Motif scaffolding. Sequence first.
Motif, PDB file in Angstrom:
ATOM      1  N   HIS A 169     -34.549  -6.029  25.468  1.00  0.00           N
ATOM      2  CA  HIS A 169     -35.949  -6.404  25.510  1.00  0.00           C
ATOM      3  C   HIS A 169     -36.090  -7.791  24.920  1.00  0.00           C
ATOM      4  CE1 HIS A 169     -38.330  -2.378  25.802  1.00  0.00           C
ATOM      5  NE2 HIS A 169     -37.081  -2.046  26.099  1.00  0.00           N
ATOM      6  N   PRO A 170     -36.272  -8.835  25.737  1.00  0.00           N
ATOM      7  CA  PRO A 170     -36.416 -10.217  25.244  1.00  0.00           C
ATOM      8  C   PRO A 170     -37.454 -10.356  24.109  1.00  0.00           C
ATOM      9  CG  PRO A 170     -36.263 -10.231  27.611  1.00  0.00           C
ATOM     10  CD  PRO A 170     -36.328  -8.781  27.216  1.00  0.00           C
ATOM     11  N   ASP A 203     -37.530  -9.807  17.160  1.00  0.00           N
ATOM     12  CA  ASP A 203     -37.912  -9.236  15.879  1.00  0.00           C
ATOM     13  C   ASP A 203     -36.823  -8.377  15.267  1.00  0.00           C
ATOM     14  OD1 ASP A 203     -39.075  -6.159  16.073  1.00  0.00           O
ATOM     15  OD2 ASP A 203     -39.642  -7.247  17.875  1.00  0.00           O
ATOM     16  N   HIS A 204     -35.692  -8.293  15.933  1.00  0.00           N
ATOM     17  CA  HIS A 204     -34.545  -7.618  15.403  1.00  0.00           C
ATOM     18  C   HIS A 204     -33.367  -8.588  15.249  1.00  0.00           C
ATOM     19  CE1 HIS A 204     -35.612  -3.223  15.860  1.00  0.00           C
ATOM     20  NE2 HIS A 204     -36.401  -3.636  16.831  1.00  0.00           N
TER      21      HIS A 204
END
Length: 16
Positions: free
Chosen positions: A5-6, A11-12
């Motif tokens: 997931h772009p 955020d990870h």
Amino acid sequence: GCCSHPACNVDHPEIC
């Protein structure tokens, strides 16, 4: 999987 997931990838920084 957030890495594939772009948007969630960002955020990870620990995973991606």
